[PDB]
Amino acid sequence: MSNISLIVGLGNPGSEYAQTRHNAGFWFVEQLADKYGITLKNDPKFHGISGRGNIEGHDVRLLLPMTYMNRSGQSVVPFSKFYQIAPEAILIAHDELDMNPGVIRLKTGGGHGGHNGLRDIVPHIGPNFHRLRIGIGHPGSKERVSGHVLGKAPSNEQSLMDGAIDHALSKVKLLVQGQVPQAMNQINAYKPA
Ligand SMILES: Nc1ccn([C@@H]2O[C@H](CO)[C@@H](O)[C@H]2O)c(=O)n1
């Protein structure tokens, strides 16, 4: 059903990418894992870091692909296939250029929206998974995007994103319980200030 049983955080591996905007998904899932005491550990068979544990009475798996962003499907696809997790039971947290820092919205379905992590996943499991879109803002230049997503946000924008992520963590209860509509209402209403 639409109970969430896999939460994927997208990002790039390595200390040099850890604090970049493109790792917003990693930030969310890492903080989720700590909140619920879920151990994230190297999972070489699935080219990622993974964990499993109890979130609010529900058995949930967590996955961070260690493939680099544009190859995220090399982790997500075989992982979800092996555990027989339908896309409708997957939440993928990812950075979103089309929303401001501090804005966070749940979306079901649709395309990759230019996101090359999602672009590597949608072809294989289809579009029908859920996304936690973590706003990272857009750069000045339309050609500045690589420099933006692989760049570190200013303390100001970082605080907004951290606050939004903190809010989302408080609503994961609704997601694993399969009240996706309520989770959408309460997440998507978040104002940073
Ligand atoms: N070694 C690297 C470095 C960066 N990336 C980034 O992931 C983005 C997917 O939107 C790509 O657009 C890119 O910015 C990646 O996949 N692999």
Numbering used by the authors: 1 to 193
Task: Reproduce the article's own wording on this structure.
Peptidyl-tRNA hydrolase (Pth) is involved in the processing of prematurely dissociated peptidyl-tRNAs from ribosome during protein biosynthesis into peptide and tRNA. Pth acts upon the ester link in peptidyl-tRNA between the peptide and the 2′ or 3′ OH group at the 3′ end of tRNA.
These structures revealed that cytidine and uridine bound to AbPth in the active site region and caused several conformational changes in the side chains of residues at the active site region in the protein resulting in the induced fits. Furthermore, the binding of cytidine in the active site caused drastic conformational changes in the side chains of Asn70, Asp98 and Asn116. These side chains in the complex moved away, from their original positions which were observed in the unbound structure, for accommodating ligand molecule. The pyrimidine ring of cytidine molecule is seen well stacked with the side chain of Tyr68 which was found to adopt a conformation in the disallowed region with φ, ψ values of 74.9°, 148.3°. The minimum distance as measured between Gly113 Cα O atom on one side to Asp98 Oδ2 atom on the opposite side of the entrance gate increased from 4.9 Å to 7.7 Å and 7.6 Å to allow the entry of cytidine and uridine respectively into the active site. In the unbound AbPth, the distances between Asn70 Oδ1 and His22 Nε2 was 4.8 Å which changed to 8.7 Å on the binding to cytidine while upon binding to uridine it changed to 8.5 Å.
